[PDB]
UniProtKB/Swiss-Prot annotation:
Keywords: Antibiotic resistance, Hydrolase, Plasmid, Signal. One of its GO terms (cellular component) is plasma membrane. Carboxylated on the epsilon-amino group of a lysine, with the resulting carbamate functional group serving as a general base. Probably N-carboxylated at Lys-50 at neutral pH in vivo and undergoes complete N-decarboxylation, at pH 4.1, in vitro. It comes from the Bacteria. Monomer. Dimer. It catalyses: a beta-lactam + H2O = a substituted beta-amino acid. This is Beta-lactamase OXA-48.
């Protein structure tokens, strides 16, 4: 059911890094990773938490739809793309933390905790500040746990409406061409050691879906592009994409 291929470590060590890639073949119900241990180590989700946060905000009516505009609060931040109005689509595309921080305040501790428990999401622990726990609080999730959660979302099996799940999968759209569709979300965790980058999602093919979750050491922001680049290299090596 699970195969470990330690030779895949070269994808990371060739960049003087370390990490884990986890792949799941939905048709064959088989998993693959370079490192079974790190596949099951729990890290802060950071901006990958925008997936469950979006679902909860939609299902409770905090967010009406993917067109609702969340106005910039006029506070100049160091990420230029954050100093503008957003909707759900652009907020997920540019990982706009302050928009999702307001979602979390409106959701509130009680409803956030119950919903993460309903999702079986990570360690389901929101200890910390309700507007920052996915960045520096107690919540943790592993790469294998990300895949379990994503599989439920793909199949509309989470305990929110079908509509909420369809909208979030639309907002996850990252790449599409004649060969495949990728729906995914990046993450970048710097407030608690070890600093890591994430990329989680799946690849839609004509007759199969491959789920993936990866994290890697990220001592500086200079390496953030390696999250997608390495993952796609693995997908190409394994003949999942051309
Ligand atoms: Cl779509």
């Amino acid at each position: 059911e699970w195969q470990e291929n330690k030779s895949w470590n070269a994808h990371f060590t060739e960049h003087k890094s370390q990490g884990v890639v986890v792949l799941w073949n939905e048709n064959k119900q088989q998993g693959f990773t370079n490192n079974l241990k790190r596949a099951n180590q729990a890290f802060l989700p950071a901006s990958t938490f925008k997936i469950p946060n979006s679902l909860i905000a939609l299902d409770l009516g905090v967010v009406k739809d993917e067109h609702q505009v969340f106005k910039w609060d006029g506070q100049t931040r160091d990420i230029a793309t954050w100093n503008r109005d957003h909707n759900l689509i652009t907020a997920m595309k540019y990982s706009v933390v302050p928009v999702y921080q307001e979602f979390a305040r409106q959701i509130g501790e009680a409803r956030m905790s119950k919903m993460l428990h309903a999702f079986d999401y990570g360690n389901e622990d929101i200890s910390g500040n309700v507007d920052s726990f996915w960045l520096d609080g107690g919540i943790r999730i592993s790469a294998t746990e990300q895949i379990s959660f994503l599989r439920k979302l793909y199949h509309n099996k989470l305990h929110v409406s079908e509509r909420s799940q369809r909208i979030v999968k639309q907002a996850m759209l990252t790449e599409a061409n004649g060969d495949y569709i990728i729906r995914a979300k990046t993450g970048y965790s710097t407030r608690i050691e070890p600093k890591i980058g994430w990329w989680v999602g799946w690849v839609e093919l004509d007759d199969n879906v491959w789920f993936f979750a990866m994290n890697m050491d990220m001592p500086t922001s200079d390496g953030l592009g390696l999250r997608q680049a390495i993952t796609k290299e693995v997908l190409k090596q394994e003949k999942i994409i051309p």
